[PDB]
Amino acid sequence: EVEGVFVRATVERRCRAGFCFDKEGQGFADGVLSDEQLEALESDPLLKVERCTFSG
Amino acid sequence: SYCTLADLIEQYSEQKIREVSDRVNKPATTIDTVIVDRAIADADSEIDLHLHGRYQLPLASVPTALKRIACGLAYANLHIVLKEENPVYKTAEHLRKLLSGIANGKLSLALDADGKPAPVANTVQISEGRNDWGADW
Amino acid sequence: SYCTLADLIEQYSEQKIREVSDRVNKPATTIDTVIVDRAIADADSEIDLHLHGRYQLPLASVPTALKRIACGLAYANLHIVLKEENPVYKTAEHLRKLLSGIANGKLSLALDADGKPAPVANTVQISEGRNDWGADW
Amino acid sequence: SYCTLADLIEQYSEQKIREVSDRVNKPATTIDTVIVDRAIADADSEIDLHLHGRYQLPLASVPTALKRIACGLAYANLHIVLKEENPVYKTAEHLRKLLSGIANGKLSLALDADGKPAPVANTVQISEGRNDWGADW
Amino acid sequence: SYCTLADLIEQYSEQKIREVSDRVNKPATTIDTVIVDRAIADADSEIDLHLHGRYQLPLASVPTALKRIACGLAYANLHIVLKEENPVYKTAEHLRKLLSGIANGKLSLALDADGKPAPVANTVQISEGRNDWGADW
Amino acid sequence: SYCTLADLIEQYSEQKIREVSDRVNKPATTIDTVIVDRAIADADSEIDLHLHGRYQLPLASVPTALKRIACGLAYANLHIVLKEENPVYKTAEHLRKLLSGIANGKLSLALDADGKPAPVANTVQISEGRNDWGADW
Amino acid sequence: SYCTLADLIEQYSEQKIREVSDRVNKPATTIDTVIVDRAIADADSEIDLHLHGRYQLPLASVPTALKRIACGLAYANLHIVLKEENPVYKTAEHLRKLLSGIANGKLSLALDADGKPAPVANTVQISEGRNDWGADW
């Protein structure tokens, strides 16, 4: 099981091309790959964040 | 893609692009799109080399000065042999000087259509700031 | 748009603009508006590159010196091949020197028609000023 | 308007102004007032560029040296093509040197007819001066 | 392998590659793949010499500027005898100047296709940081 | 042995090696292996002279840049008389410049096939470090 | 004896050694061993002059670079009259530059066959070191 999910329509910093804008991607508290890119992508939320059990 | 085949034709006329792009037919008849695409890609790669330290790479918009620089570099790249005193070489050198001036913070990257470019966060970084005892306790 | 086709014609006569703008008819017959527009746009882009750090980009008015500089750069851009000793190239270099002097704070951007230009707020910034105990308590 | 068509005619004779101003008739017959006006305006714009930091822009009077400088620059602007060794170009360079010397505070702007010009308040600024306890209390 | 035979053909046309690669047939008929491979390998070795101190050696992706540099150096290597004033030699010198600028931290290695290159950990190193008494005890 | 006869033939074609190696038959017929071996040995000796202070001498692997440098120096050594303006002399000088840059720590010795070279322990040396009272007693 | 007659013949071909060594027969027929021996001895003496301050004089082994340098100097010594622009003189000057670089500690004397040369004890000297009270009493 993976612990870590953000499902409150919450905002996170995801960078597409030359800018970082609101979007929900990985949104997990565990990492095995893309750690250096995840840091920029996984900036903790701006707004209310609540976690669930995807169990994927 | 800071410049396109249309931009090259407009800046240097279609005849010159045909002459410097068609390498298999003598006299030239058609413009080779692959060669022009490679030249434009090389110009963009050089410009990114110059601009990587101050702005984001995948620019969402192309500033006009960037279009002129890309067109000039692409045309200079379409010449198999380019001597030192060729005026096209001098134009390429002037454009490279403009790029270097931009990189060294002496020139600013202008407006794209109405909004500013996107500078990188290189200057933003500061430690964090520890100022307890100053929060209206 | 610091200069227009009318300005180019007035500064360099309509014959020269026709000769350097009509690339498909020999002898030239008409002035190509698209080519002139692109040349003027490139001149404006270079000028903005030089002026971005001291004034606002979308200027609401065009200073006269800016008109002369734009006309010169636009005419220099209408030449497909421009050698070093061509006098038009020397005029372009002098105008670029004027632009660089303006950027480095050695020359001021003059009046547009009656009012001053709009300098940027780069110099304005100061921290804020903490001067409690000095407010006539 | 630091110089007029009368000043240009007086300084360079009416024949030369006619020759360098009439671009549509060969041989020249009349002096084109619009071209002369644009050249004079460009000269005034350059002079204002040089003088904006030390004096007010809309000068109410024209100093005589300013008249000579404007006439020279206007005549130099009436040449479509101007080479480096052309004596008119050298005269323009000397006048620009005079303007730069004025801007850098090495030369003073002379009398207009009987009174001084109007310097800007750039040097005037001082904080305010806090000298309580020294007001004969 | 920052460049391939296809890249060389596209940049310099197949005729020139055939002429400078076929050494046994006069006139040339086919492109010798072994010679081209060795030239490309030598260009890659020089580029790695220049880039070893700032990035990882076995790059997983080839930046576009790297492709242009490799193509130029490979073509310059295909000449048995290369004089100083040969334009190909000048192009090789310019590319080497670009490489040196990259090595000295004046130019950045651009995007490969969409992501950044992989800089080495040379700057990362710090001792460790001993800050006991500051861990919220 | 950073380069072999095969490398020399591949880089300079077998005809040129035959011409500069066969000294007893006119016209040349065969490549003298002893002369080529001595030239390659001399090139290796010079390269070791340049690289002795930063890497181990008996390298277990030959970096590609080292192969190119050795081939160039060996070819330059096969000329009994070599003038200053001979292009082969210029190539040898450029390769020597590369070697000097490597020695002075401005260029890194690249990968051999997949692994790094073996730098010497010159920088490793430190006294030993006396830090009693800091061993968690 | 860093080089022998065999080395000179191999490096410069037997014909040239015969031509520059036989002074009594015209045309030359045989190589004079005494003259070659004296030239080699003079080259060795110069090399020892350059290397006396960093290595032992009676070297038990001859490094390969030393062989090349000795051969070049010996050949240069076999010319009764040697002008400045003679290429052999330039080669001798380059070899002397290599020797000077070795002496000034910018180049290292390479391996002889498998082992290092024998540096002198010039750097070893230190007073002795008085550190009583630090011998675990």
Enumerate residues 91 to 130 of chain E having a beta carbon within 8 A of any beta carbon in chain F. 103
Output the CA angle B55-B61-B66, nearest 5 degrees. Answer: 70
Check: CB of residue C105 under 8 Å from CB of residue C45.
Answer: no
Question: In whole angstroms, what is the distance from residue C57 CA to residue B110 CA?
Answer: 8
Residue type, B89: Y
- Cα angle vertex B50, ends E54, E116, to 5°? 50
CA angle E92, B72, B103 (to 5 degrees): 75
Question: Is residue E34 less than 8 Å (CB to CB) from chain F?
Answer: yes
Q: Up-side HSE of residue D80: CA atoms within 13 Å toward CB?
A: 17
The span from the CA of E34 to the CA of E32, in Å, is 6
Please, what is the Cα angle at B7 between B3 and B11, to 5 degrees?
125
DSSP letter (8 states) at residue D45: H
**B15 interface with C at CB cutoff 8 Å:** yes
The resolution in angstroms reads 8.0
Cβ-nearest to E46 among F12, F65, F116 = F65
CA–CA distance, D121 with E41 (Å, rounded to integer): 68
Q: Are B42 and B100 in contact (CB under 8 A)?
A: no
With an 8 Å CB cutoff and a minimum of 3 pairs, decide whether chains F and G touch.
yes
Tell me how many residue pairs between chain B and chain C have CB atoms under 8 A apart.
Answer: 57
Subunits with 3+ Cβ pairs within 8 Å of C are: B, D
C75 vs D: CB within 8 A: no
Chain A residues close to B57, C-beta within 8 Å: 17-18
Contacts 24+ apart (CB under 8 A), B16-25: B16/C80, B17/B78, B20/B75, B20/B78, B20/B79, B21/B78, B23/E13, B23/E15
Q: Could A17 and B56 be called an inter-chain contact, meaning their C-beta atoms sit closer than 8 Å?
A: yes
Residue E82 contacts F where some CB pair is shorter than 8 Å: yes
B–A contact (≥3 CB pairs within 8 Å)?
yes
CA-to-CA dists, residue F63 to E4, F3, F41, F66, angstroms: 21, 10, 17, 5
**Closest C-alpha to E40, from E64, E76, E11:** E76
Q: Which of G61, G60, G12 is nearest to G39 (CA)?
A: G12
Cα dihedral E20/E26/E28/E34 (nearest 10): -60
Phi-psi region of G105 (alpha: psi -120 to 50; beta: other; left: phi over 0): left
Q: Which residue of E has its CA nearest to F69?
A: E42
Give the tokens for residue E113: 């296709």
Distance from the Cα of G17 to chain F's closest Cα (Å) equals 12
- Which amino acid type is present at position C19? E
Measured between beta carbons, the chain B residues lying within 8 angstroms of C21 are: none
Give the closest-approach CA distance of B117 to chain A in angstroms.
10
Contact E109 B52 (CB under 8 A): yes
Q: How far apart are CA D10 and CA D75, in angstroms?
A: 12
Residue numbers in B near C120 (CB within 8 A): none
Contacts of C114 (CB under 8 A, 6+ apart): D58
Structure tokens, A21: 């804008």
- Alpha-carbon distances, residue E24 vs D123, E14, E34, F28, G121 (angstroms): 81, 17, 13, 17, 57
Neighbours of G113 (CB within 10 A): 8
Q: How many CB atoms lie within 10 A of CB G103?
A: 15
Rounded CA-CA distance G40/G64 in Å is 15
Task: Name the burial class of residue E112, with classes exposed (0-12), middle (13-18) and buried (19+) by CB atoms within 10 angstroms of its CB.
Answer: middle
Which subunits have 3 or more CB–CB pairs within 8 Å of chain E?
B, F
Q: How far apart are CA B57 and CA B60, in angstroms?
A: 9
Beta-strand pair A13-15/A20-22: antiparallel
Quickly count: other Cβ atoms within 10 Å of residue B15's Cβ: 13
- Mutation to test the B interface, candidates E2, E98, E111, E136, most B Cβ within 10 Å: E111
Cis-peptide, bond into residue G27, ω within 30° of zero: yes
Task: Check contact A-C (3+ Cβ pairs < 8 Å).
Answer: no
Check: CB of residue F18 under 8 Å from CB of residue F28. Answer: yes
DSSP C42-88: HHHHHHHHHHTTTB-SS-SS--HHHHHHHHHHHHHHT-SS--TT-HH
Q: Which of B63, B69, B59, B47 is nearest to B119 (CA)?
A: B59
Do residue F68 and residue E23 have CB atoms under 8 angstroms apart?
no
Q: What residues of chain E lie within 8 A of the CB of B41, using their CB?
A: 64
Mutation site, B48, B54, B56, interface A, largest A CB count within 10 A = B56
Q: Do E35 and F110 touch (CB under 8 A)?
A: no
Q: Which of E21, E15, E2 is nearest to E75 (CA)?
A: E21
CB nearest to B35's CB, from E10, E106, E110: E10
